[PDB]
From a paper:
NDCBE (SLC4A8) mediates Na+-driven Cl‾/CO32‾ exchange and belongs to the Na+-dependent group of the solute carrier family 4 (SLC4) transporters. NDCBE exchanges one Na+ and one CO32‾ ion for one Cl‾ ion4,5. Na+‒driven Cl‾/CO32‾ exchange activity plays an important role in pH regulation in specific cells throughout the brain, kidney and the rest of the body. SLC4 monomers consist of a large C-terminal transmembrane domain (TMD), involved in transport mediation, and a smaller N-terminal cytoplasmic domain (CD).
Author numbering:
A (entry chain B), B (entry chain A): 451 to 1021
The structure:
Amino acid sequence: LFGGLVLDVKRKAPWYWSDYRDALSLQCLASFLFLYCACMSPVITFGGLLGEATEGRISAIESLFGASMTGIAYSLFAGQPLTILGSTGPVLVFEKILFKFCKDYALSYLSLRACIGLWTAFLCIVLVATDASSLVCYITRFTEEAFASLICIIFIYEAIEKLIHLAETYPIHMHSQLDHLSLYYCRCALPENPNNHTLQYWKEHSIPTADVNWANLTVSECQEMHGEFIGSACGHHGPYTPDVLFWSCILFFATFIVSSTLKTFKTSRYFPTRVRSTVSDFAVFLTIFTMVILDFLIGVPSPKLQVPSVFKPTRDDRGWFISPIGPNPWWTVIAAIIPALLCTILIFMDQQITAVIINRKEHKLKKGCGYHLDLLVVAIMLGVCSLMGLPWFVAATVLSITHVNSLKLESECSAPGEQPKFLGIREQRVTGLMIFVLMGCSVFMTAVLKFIPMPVLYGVFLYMGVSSLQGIQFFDRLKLFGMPAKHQPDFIYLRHVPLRKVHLFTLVQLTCLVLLWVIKASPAAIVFPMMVLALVFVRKVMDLCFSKRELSWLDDLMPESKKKKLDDAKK
Amino acid sequence: LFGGLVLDVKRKAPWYWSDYRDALSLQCLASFLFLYCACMSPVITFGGLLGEATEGRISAIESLFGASMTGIAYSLFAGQPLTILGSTGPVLVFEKILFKFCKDYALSYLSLRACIGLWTAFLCIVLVATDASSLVCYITRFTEEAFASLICIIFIYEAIEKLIHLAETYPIHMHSQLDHLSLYYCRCALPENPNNHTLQYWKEHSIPTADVNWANLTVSECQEMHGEFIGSACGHHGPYTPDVLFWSCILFFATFIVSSTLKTFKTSRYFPTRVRSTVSDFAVFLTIFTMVILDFLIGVPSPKLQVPSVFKPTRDDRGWFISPIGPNPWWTVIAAIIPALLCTILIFMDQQITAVIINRKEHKLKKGCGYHLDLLVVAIMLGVCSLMGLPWFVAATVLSITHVNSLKLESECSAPGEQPKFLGIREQRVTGLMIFVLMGCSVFMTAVLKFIPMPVLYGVFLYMGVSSLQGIQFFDRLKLFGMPAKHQPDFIYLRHVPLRKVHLFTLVQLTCLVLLWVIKASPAAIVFPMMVLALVFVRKVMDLCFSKRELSWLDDLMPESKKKKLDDAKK
Ligand code: NA
């Protein structure tokens, strides 16, 4: 109820200091380096992708600042501070819709977006007052996993989409004809039967004496007269990249084989435990390090994550921090209630589901946890980031899970080679702080990531997407389609529910994935969070479609390993 | 004594028909398909490499003809049908020196080599008459593993090394730095301040008015015209290749990863076992299938394997069948006894050590073998090859072993995935025949391998090298010196033979390996076989340096498999 959220803080304050001294060097150092690089790339790409859309009033710097701020407060005042936030599809689409709505009565974007951001923030406060942890517990595995797994796959989907997309901006000579190598050339030249736009572009910009200069230009230079890249070395607007496409694929493919090699070192027998694990958690940093040397030696001009080195608010119509919201006539502010209310619901439900996925019996919880405090800290930080007109980041699934696995407490007497002991997972509360502090300080740090190529981070991302789901029981079953039925291990959840019913839960769950997939692909697509509601309604039905016993074997709330221990000790 | 190799044939007669009907498709098909390709490129690089050496007296086709016969007869008429007689170092150097010796008193090269070939054939005939078999016992695991490990290590190195050479002969740019890509050029041009060498080459070949040609000649034409390549894309003699390095590396890595993935699919569990196992054997065939297709589609010119379709003598002044030697001074033929005596010794020991390495009991077969038959068919094949003026071939290590490992019976009764029972190996002896049958018929066909570039054959080569060294006990151990003794792998040495004693033995084995290694690298390298002699002498000394019980564990002529059975049935 109202004033019952105090109990969360009271129940985490004795533990608060005790969770700093928990932290160690040689593990956290590595986790911080890993998450620092990981977290930086989506913020910048998102900031840019969003920059074009909301017409140059938002850019890399605005996303960097809001992201620094958010990370610093979240890692301090969260009742589950192990979620490492990252943007999602509803925000990106929502902003575009806000933008399309903001093409009439469009006197300031910023004042309208602060009014919308404030209404949804304050509403998130109204939700934590009433009924934020009075319904949350009604959920079960079907829906939480349908949501988690589907999202995780998109993580992989855009890792690949990122690579294939590059393939469009970097083409190749499709048959080299080396004998004709010395004949290859490409020069810029004037349009032949030129379009009006090229025509208008040339006239109104006033370029004098272009003929002495048109015989050969640099790559940027031709793009500014809009001329044809004519030659036998031109098959697309972008010249024929010799090697970027095919090196990029080598970087991409080598990372996903090598990164998996490094994380499985933990169970190797060739060393004692002390030099083993410590090679197996520097992994992402070593893969960044070696692909960096290979790229340095044999110089392919492969893309990198670039960050600007100039510090400013963009468009000269922003202060660093700007309070005023007067320009829109007053009524629009009142009219914003219906979108901000749809958003407070999508934001609320995203957050809470993600909290449910952290607060399972996987990634064991040692101490108590709070829903209301978690929601409180996103709601206050959403309100202030919106008050400074900066980008929003919401608790993402795969990021939280990989953050939680990198730092971890493990036994002092490990079995010879085989049988590593999980023995919990760490919560420090200081690397989350430092990551977003050091990424805040990287407005003027441009050298460190510029070298770090884009492809190696893309592999890191896809590997991340794959390894989060090794603990999600559903994917295991998804991969059981071509597998025979006598070939699996004991898997108690298989022995007392028929094969026909196992496949039948996988087909239906897969149907709702396919259903999500098409709603995501609609030119609206914001129904998706609210779809988790329907996945609960339908779920209840299924007790009658199939026996209640028949779901107490799969969705069963306690994890499969424990029930294997339990049922074997009964017999 | 004499006529004592007859027992081998008497012991190979009973099995004769049963070892064709033993033969089964898809485990033999795939092996043939991978080998056909593998063996042709091996006898093609050695025939063209001898061609430059013998001023075009011996050709690759002469090499194809000798190879087709050498293999065809051997797989019919030997005592081990899984040995493949490959293009080996000793031949080349012998032929060099011989060519160098036939510059004083060397009117004819072909007749002199044929006389030596008949003499060394003859020397193996008196050797094979008496005691070919008895002296085999003096060779043991020490020497054979030392010898073998080095050969496989070298083979792996020249897979990688050959690839480096391709990048060296098709030069690459350190940095493209794309903006100036379009600015780059290189055109052929007349030599300025011409060197005496190109001055001379130009003059005597009589090619007038090259100035009108040298505005811009093609890469092939300029590179044999000794003209200077002048431009910004020529830092060196030839323009930088856009795509050859990265495409060759993609074929190389890809082939090395997919064949080893596929070959371990036996111990994966995605399908019923019967349809599982068939896929793994053809994987080499599958890597070939898909890479030929991919290169067919988007082409990157890279060197491709061609064979002379035209069936002829070389230089059109030498008869096919040639003639019996007679023109040379009679005495030179008698003088050839000493070089040929040297040759016989090395040929007998090189042959015999490879045959010992195949006829291990960890390499056991459900059939016999005959050393004396193998030398005998080698001796016939050595005389006929020499009388017809063709290249000789001595037993190569990796080819014979990758044959053996590629086809092996393995049980399908096993538990799914892990533990596929070893159940001996497979010696049908019908694939060797079928390989060499198809390259014999594929001497006037060239269309088959013109569409397979070298790099993919090189990735096959790297897979051959890595997978081959399975059976070598020593290399396993070298890789266990890092492993501690807390959870050390089960090697017999820990309780029966002290770590100190295993180490002293491995260090002395390694020193004699490094000594065989420097000997190989020596500008003679005739001395490589006689060293094997020394490896015995040194073996004897240790009979006073150590108890004999403590060395019967790793140099046993009964495998570990038997010791594991014995020592487990005692306790
Ligand atoms: Na999300």
